[PDB]
């Protein structure tokens, strides 16, 4: 049982081509969703900062975005992560606020029945 990496330049170009069709389908929105900033859970890397999965419910409510719409404007949700330190709430709320600063939202046509 042996594996060869001859398709390594083939697979990389397939991935790039897979990104370009995604960009074609969804033009204005970025090819990647926003991710939060979290700290690795170990004494070795705890002083580091990296990306998370999504923004917890305290990070959404504090920033001012409901949890239902957040999934629609590209902000992802992590029901499992929680905020134990306020610096973790702060680094990710401002991460949301800077995102909503640059976020153009296209209006959608809405059904308007004659009566009500």
């Amino acid at each position: 049982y042996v594996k060869t990496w001859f398709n390594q330049p083939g697979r990389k170009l397939r991935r790039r081509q897979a990104r370009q069709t995604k960009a074609a389908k969804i033009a204005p929105r970025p090819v990647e969703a926003i991710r939060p900033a979290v700290k690795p859970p170990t004494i070795r890397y705890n002083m580091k900062v990296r990306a998370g999965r999504g923004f917890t419910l305290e990070e959404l409510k504090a920033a001012g975005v409901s949890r239902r719409v957040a999934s629609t404007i590209g902000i992802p949700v992590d029901h499992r992560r929680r905020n134990r330190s306020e610096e973790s709430l702060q680094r990710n709320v401002e991460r949301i606020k800077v995102y909503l600063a640059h976020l153009i939202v296209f209006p959608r046509k809405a059904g308007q029945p004659k009566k009500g």
Binding site: R19, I26, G116
Partner: protein
């Protein structure tokens, strides 16, 4: 090699060919017509998003971005938008305003049933004690609450 591959190589039937291989050609843009018009057909999406004033990824680039030329107390605060660095972003933003401008009439009128429904309540229980008029049941057939009765009162105005 295989029997199935080999019998149709000897036979006289033409091979079910497909001239599909178009290497190096990118996926043509559909969706937003504005960006399609300003989409260079040769540049990569990281290059075209940048040239168009759009972020391809709000998350950290995991690699080395091209250097073509030798380049020389707050939870209540809100970020006062981001001015567009390109015309094309302003084109996208301008359309957002106009689309919202058309969809401005979010107030709904009333149908006949709830129209006479609100008159019957209004002319009997005044116009201020909405809780009391929600407490009555002889005229409040559907047993609306005070909150929805006020909404109907506002909606009937215009």
């Amino acid at each position: 090699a295989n029997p199935r591959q080999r019998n149709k190589q000897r036979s006289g039937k033409p091979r079910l060919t497909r001239r599909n291989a178009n290497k190096k050609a990118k996926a043509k843009i559909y969706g937003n017509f504005v960006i399609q018009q300003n989409w260079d057909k040769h540049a990569t999406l990281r290059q075209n998003y940048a040239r168009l004033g759009l972020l391809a990824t709000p998350n950290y680039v995991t690699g080395g971005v091209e250097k073509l030329y030798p380049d020389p107390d707050v939870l209540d605060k809100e970020i006062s938008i981001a001015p567009a660095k390109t015309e094309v972003v302003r084109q996208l933003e301008e359309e957002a305003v106009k689309k919202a401008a058309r969809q401005s009439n979010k107030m709904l009128p009333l149908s006949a049933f709830e129209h006479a429904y609100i008159q019957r309540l209004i002319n009997k229980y005044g116009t201020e004690d909405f809780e009391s008029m929600a407490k009555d049941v002889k005229l409040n057939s559907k047993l609306f609450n005070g909150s929805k009765l006020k909404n109907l009162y506002i909606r009937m105005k215009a």
